[PDB]
Design a protein around this nucleic acid. Structure first.
Ligand SMILES: [Mg+2]
Ligand SMILES: [Zn+2]
Ligand SMILES: [Zn+2]
Length: 1259
DNA sequence: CCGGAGCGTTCAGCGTTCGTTTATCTCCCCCTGGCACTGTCATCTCCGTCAGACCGTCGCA
DNA sequence: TGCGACGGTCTGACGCTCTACACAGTGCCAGGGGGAGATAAACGAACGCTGAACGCTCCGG
């Protein structure tokens, strides 16, 4: 598996694959139910349907396998041969391929200079095509044919003159005889009128035949190859008049004959000549066509695959006709399509056997062509073939395309064995590495292991007896099951699996019931509530799989979230409330025994059990030797005339008993914490523990925190009664005053002194004031003791706006189609809404539900696009030799006389490395190539630095992939990233995970459309897809004088740069709201109008670093407006994948086409190649493209095919005959090999393991 | 004190019975061919995606 | 040729199981060729009958 090739398949290859001809449309016999001979499903062509048997019934045994039966020809072998053995159909008339005709010009190619409508007219038998003309023979005898035509014209004119003379004589004769007879008074006038009517009719006939001769003559005089004529009567006239001069044809045979005489190299030369001298859209034409001609010139694939003579067939087991219970049959649609193809081909053969008219033959040929096209693509042209009358008939290309195709439903995602699924329940008795599997589910997963152990422990005689015991379910089987599942990890997995931690390895443990017991401490890593949530369990099977489960996937090793490096395995519902209650202050709770000395924590616990001491009471408590004092305890000390060190020995501290118990949970080496914990302080404590302590200690400490959090949340006394939710007493008088002034405004409006829009605006303004003020009143009324505030102020669960709309009034609520009702909801959920208030609240609720459904769908789509563009980005080197980096701001927004560090330094500068040392006073502050943390950044900002040159992934120049040092330390593990970690996939998952968490939509348009830019997740998609924004703000090209032009039809802006530069003019709509002065000084940096800048021009006029900063900052301010934090390197990986290409111009010396996508590495290699030859290099402008366009424009066609476009990329690969190296992860998942990342690298699989000499000597 | 008779086992004459084929005689399946007043253009699709892009196409300028 | 715009074309439109189903209006027979099954015979084989015949222990007058 060095690589995988693809190309056009000629008739020879199709015949070589085939084991025979499918000469009959019959599939199976209706009585014997055996496949027919020499047709579809035939055993002679496709192999035996039985095992080692054959059609005629002879040769039943297995011994004489691999022989050809003389009676029927069926080779005796296995039935699975029918999954690999194919045949072919020979066509009576050649037909074209529907992928290449009727497609994109990158796919059709315009190989022959014909329009797509012209190709349609020629191949579907509506117009003849002149494939060959003897041009030199036609031009050599021009005087002879001209003389013949002149002779024909002369004799025609002589006949016309003789006829005119005879007609005149007849007219004179009849006039004379009817004027001599005198039958009527004016019969001579009537006969003269009839005669002249005859004269004009014959003159019309003469002029129409003269025009016919003239038009056929000028049709022959302008006759070239690839010239069509719609009128078959006209072509018949040319054939009957002119012979052996021009060769004509009709249908796909005309294209085949044209491709027989096609001379592609001279056409390529002519297109290159037009490239040298050409303008306009034809230029682009002269570009695109040339590319496809090059695709037929450089590679070895002949264009004989353009039109096909033989049709391959699927092996019959991949288009099965299976028996169904009740005597029915289930048949694939490809059997119907193939049957139609053979039917039409056989009918065409029968028509060609005997004498048939050309119209019937051409009609049957067109039917055969349409049958082949519907076989390859049903529904590409016209109405799709339906069948029973309900749904379109599935074709060959419809299972290589879309969600139902082979690439996405059967290769990337597959069903698995040794897997199960059950609902989850919380088990607090479990450790962090444990999960509770039911008896039946674990017995079914570990069935062969249980059978082997039963055989080994001689409880069963053999495998069959062990299987019978397992199926019966005896108690010794369950004892064996308990013995087996130990030390054998299983992978728990929740279905949405947005990010990396959706699959985690746990040690299984037998539990009762039928539900999986999961640890609470890990649930939010899975985003798993216990409303109802089925989790799947997969079984790592070999030593490698369960080794990776134990080492890489263990749930106790995944404390930190890979998105931003913050801890994720500290859920907050009940444990944080308990720890907060334990560690909170004595505010609002009656402290008994406050301010009394205690000898030890045990005595304080005894006093608490006695009841004369409460948990929250400032007491003077002594601590034994080995207890580390708080970090703030060091500057104070005990007063003594002798030297003392309270860092290692006993000390007294003024604290509550709850803090003493909480620090009993924490390790003895950890410094004492003397503050209210809650949630955020718990986050910094857990982050410090994960940073400074080993994994097992961290797992034990989170287990202790979990256990004591549950324990003290039980005794915290939190509950909900109707007296626990309190409406403010001020709310009644405040809403009374606001209704009084609202009644005053309304009775003022009834006189018409104010418009309704102004009244609505002031009403929503004053009611927003009222709801903010009553929120303030509620936030003043609450005590620190009631459970609802105790669980919203502790970060446990809840938000302040939920308490605002539970205790105080709901506030302004959006109406349908996104405006606000002027009348608010004055009732709290405790008081109960009225009927109409409930209705207008349902207006917003249903919108929210629909919005979050579509938002999570779009987030999944964005995640898929990001993963497919960001793959094949793997740390492949330990370090670069580089010292180039990114200049990031470290301290900003400084006041007078002080310096403040950056607000978002955690996701911008942290977890990176310095490209070079930093010195301010001649001494180094921080070394080079070290991770940045709190203390180092604090030292930098204290010593007085304003910017830091840090080593980023955008500036990485490595020969393969990116290095570990330029990427920086990994955020999932907190250490330096290993060589082989897929950083692109981690980056894509981290970007796409909070897409459903954003929950953003424009509140109100304000009555104007287009004034507001896209916000939320669609803004992120627009940013990553390189699309021009909805509100575009043009950027000035150069510094100069800017002025406005207020033309009535459309506004206009004109800026003239100084230093003789050319003036640039931008058109602006009348609804502009710009911010630049009229006739003022402007430069490149600022924007002329207000809106969202287009990143393409930002790349164009400012540079690649400026547009990198722009994109990173834009996506980070979209994400930061909600509150989600994502590190900058995750964005920068995709941004580097975004700027990887270049658009080339004046490429007359680099010997390739101009104005197309070129990779940076290939362009640079071509630049060295052309400067080593001495020629001047071509020009190249960096091109910023979407993630979809960067995904499709990839070297490997397997990854391109498995992505969105599935038919066009395969045609393009077939024309280009491109073979893909099997590097990358999608085309290694597809083929089944190891991915080239992580444990699948070559540098990890080449180690050899043997024991040491002393270990052998010991035993 | 061998001699004969009865008994055990083992083979050559012709005498019948099997093991496996063969052509002829009913019953059925399956494919090609005949019908002679005249009778010479069907068929319903497809709408309250959807969101914007990519692209060629095309008449106006 | 540049212009918008007109239009067709094309693509996907988070994830799983618990659940999970099936699918409907217009002819008819005669003459002839093959192979499935029943028939009665046939050339060759071996299958039995004929006890005879060789040789042994044998009780023996
Ligand atoms: Mg749930
Ligand atoms: Zn056979
Ligand atoms: Zn590097």
């Amino acid at each position: 598996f060095d690589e995988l090739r693809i190309g056009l398949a000629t008739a020879d290859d199709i015949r070589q694959w085939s084991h025979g001809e499918v000469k009959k449309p019959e599939t199976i016999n209706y009585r014997t139910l055996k496949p027919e001979k020499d047709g579809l499903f035939c055993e002679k062509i496709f192999g035996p349907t039985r095992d080692w048997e054959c059609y005629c019934g002879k040769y039943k045994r297995v011994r004489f396998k691999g022989i050809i039966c003389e009676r029927c020809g069926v080779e005796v072998t296995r039935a699975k041969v029918r999954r690999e053995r194919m045949g072919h159909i020979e066509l009576a008339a050649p037909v074209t391929h529907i992928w290449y005709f009727k497609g994109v010009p990158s796919r059709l190619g315009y190989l022959l200079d014909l329009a797509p409508k012209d190709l349609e007219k020629v191949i579907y038998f509506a117009a003849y095509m002149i494939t060959f003309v003897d041009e030199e023979r036609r031009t050599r005898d021009l005087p002879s044919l001209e003389a013949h035509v002149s002779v024909e014209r002369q004799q025609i004119e002589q006949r016309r003159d003789s006829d005119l003379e005879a007609r005149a004589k007849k007219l004179e004769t009849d006039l004379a005889e009817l004027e001599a007879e005198g039958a009527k008074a004016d019969v001579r006038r009537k006969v003269r009128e009839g005669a002249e009517r005859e004269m004009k009719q014959l003159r019309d006939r003469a002029q129409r035949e003269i025009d016919r001769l003239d038009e056929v003559w000028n049709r022959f005089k302008n006759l070239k190859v690839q010239d069509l004529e719609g009128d078959e009567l006209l072509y018949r006239e040319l054939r009957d008049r002119f012979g052996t001069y021009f060769d004509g044809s009709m249908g796909a045979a005309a294209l085949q004959k044209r491709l027989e005489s096609f001379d592609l190299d001279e056409e390529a030369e002519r297109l290159r000549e037009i490239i040298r001298t050409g303008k306009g859209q034809k230029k682009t034409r002269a570009l695109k066509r040339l590319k496809v001609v090059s695709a037929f010139l450089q590679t070895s694939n002949s264009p004989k695959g353009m039109v096909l003579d033989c049709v391959p067939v699927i092996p019959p087991d991949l288009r099965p006709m299976v028996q169904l219970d009740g005597g029915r049959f289930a048949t694939s649609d490809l059997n119907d399509l193939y049957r139609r193809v053979i039917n039409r081909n056989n009918r065409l053969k029968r028509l060609l056997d005997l004498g048939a008219p050309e119209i019937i033959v051409n009609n049957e040929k067109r039917m055969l062509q349409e049958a082949v096209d519907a076989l390859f693509d049903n529904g590409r042209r016209g109405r799709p073939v339906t069948g029973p009358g309900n749904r379109p008939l599935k074709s060959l290309s419809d299972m290589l395309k879309g969600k139902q195709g082979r690439f996405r439903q059967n290769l990337l995602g597959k069903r698995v064995d040794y897997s199960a699924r059950s609902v989850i329940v919380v088990g607090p008795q479990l450790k962090l590495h444990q999960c509770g599997l039911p008896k039946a589910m674990a017995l079914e997963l570990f069935k062969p292991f249980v059978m082997k152990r039963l055989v080994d422990l001689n409880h069963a005689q053999n495998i069959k007896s062990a299987k019978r015991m397992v199926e019966r379910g005896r108690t010794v089987v369950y004892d064996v099951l308990e013995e087996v599942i130990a030390e054998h990890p299983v992978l728990l997995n929740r279905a949405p699996t947005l990010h990396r931690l959706g699959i985690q390895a746990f040690e299984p443990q037998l539990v009762e019931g039928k539900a999986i017991q999961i640890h609470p401490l890990v649930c939010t890593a899975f985003n798993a509530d216990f409303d109802g949530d089925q989790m799947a369990v997969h079984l790592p099977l070999s030593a490698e799989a369960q080794a990776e489960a134990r080492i890489l996937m263990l749930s106790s090793n995944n404390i930190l979230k890979p998105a931003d490096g913050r801890p994720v395995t500290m859920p907050t519902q009940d444990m944080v409330l308990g720890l907060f209650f334990l560690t909170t202050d004595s505010e609002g709770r009656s402290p008994k025994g406050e301010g009394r000395a205690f000898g030890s924590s045990a005595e304080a616990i005894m006093a608490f059990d006695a009841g004369d001491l409460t948990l929250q009471a400032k007491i003077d408590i002594r601590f034994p030797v080995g207890t580390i004092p708080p970090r703030g305890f060091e500057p104070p000390a005990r007063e003594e005339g002798e030297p003392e060190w309270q860092q290692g020995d006993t000390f007294t501290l003024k604290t509550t008993l709850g803090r003493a118990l909480f620090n009993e949970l924490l390790p003895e080496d950890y410094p004492f914490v003397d503050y209210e914990v809650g949630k955020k302080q718990l986050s910094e404590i857990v982050n410090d523990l994960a940073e400074r302590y080993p994994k097992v200690i961290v797992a034990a400490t989170l287990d202790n925190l979990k256990a004591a959090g549950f324990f003290w949340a039980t005794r915290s006394g939190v509950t909900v009664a109707i007296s626990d939710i309190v409406v403010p007493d001020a709310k009644k008088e405040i809403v009374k005053g606001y209704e009084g002034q609202d009644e005053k405004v309304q009775k003022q409006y009834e006189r018409g002194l104010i418009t309704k829009e102004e009244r609505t605006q002031e009403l929503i303004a004053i009611w927003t004031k009222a709801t903010n003020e009553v929120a303030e009143a509620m936030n003043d009324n609450f005590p620190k003791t009631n459970p609802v505030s105790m669980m919203v102020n502790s970060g446990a669960r809840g938000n302040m706006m939920q308490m605002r709309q539970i205790a105080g009034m709901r506030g302004l609520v959006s109406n349908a189609k996104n405006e606000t009702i002027p009348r608010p909801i004055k009732a709290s959920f405790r008081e109960g809404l009225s009927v109409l208030e409930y209705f207008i609240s349902t207006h917003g609720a249903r919108k929210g539900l629909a919005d979050t459904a579509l938002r999570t769908a779009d987030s999944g789509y964005l995640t898929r696009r990001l993963v497919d563009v960001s793959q094949d980005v793997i740390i492949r080197e330990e370090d670069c030799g580089t010292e180039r980096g990114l200049k990031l701001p470290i301290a900003t927004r400084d006041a007078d006389g002080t310096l403040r560090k950056a607000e978002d330094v955690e996701t911008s500068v942290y977890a990176r490395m310095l490209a070079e040392d930093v010195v301010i006073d001649g001494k180094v502050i921080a070394p080079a190539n070290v991770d940045l943390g709190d203390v180092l950044i604090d030292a930098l900002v204290a010593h007085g630095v304003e910017e830091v040159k840090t080593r980023s992934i955008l500036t990485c120049e490595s020969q393969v992939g990116t290095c570990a040092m330029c990427y920086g330390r990994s955020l999932a593990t907190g250490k330096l990233v290993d060589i082989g970690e897929a950083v692109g996939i981690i980056a894509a998952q981290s970007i796409g995970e909070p897409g459903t968490q954003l929950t953003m939509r424009t509140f109100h348009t304000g009555g104007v459309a287009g004034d507001d830019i896209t916000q939320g997740l669609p803004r992120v998609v627009e940013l990553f897809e390189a699309r021009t924004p909805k509100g575009v703000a043009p950027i000035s090209e150069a510094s100069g004088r800017v002025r406005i032009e207020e033309t009535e039809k459309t506004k206009k802006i004109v800026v003239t740069p100084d230093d003789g530069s050319d003036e640039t003019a931008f058109p602006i709509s009348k609804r502009a709201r710009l911010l630049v002065g009229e006739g003022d000084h402007v430069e490149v940096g600022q924007k002329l109008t207000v809106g969202a800048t287009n990143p393409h021009d930002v790349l164009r006029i400012l540079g690649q670093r400026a547009v990198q900063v722009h994109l990173v900052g834009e996506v980070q301010k979209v994400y930061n407006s909600q509150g989600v934090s994502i590190h900058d390197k995750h964005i920068e990986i995709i941004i580097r994948q975004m700027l990887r290409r270049v658009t080339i111009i004046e490429s007359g010396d680099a010997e390739l086409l101009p104005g197309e996508l070129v990779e940076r590495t290939k362009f640079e290699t071509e630049n060295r190649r052309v400067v080593q030859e001495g020629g001047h290099p071509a020009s190249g402008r960096p091109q910023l493209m979407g993630i979809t366009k960067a995904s499709l424009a990839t070297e490997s066609w397997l990854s391109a095919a498995s992505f969105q476009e599935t038919t066009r990329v395969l045609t393009d690969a077939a024309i280009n005959a491109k073979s893909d190296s099997l590097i990358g992860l999608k085309e290694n998942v597809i083929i089944g090999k190891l991915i080239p990342a992580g444990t699948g690298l070559s540098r990890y699989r080449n180690i050899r393991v043997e024991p040491t000499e002393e270990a052998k000597a010991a035993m």
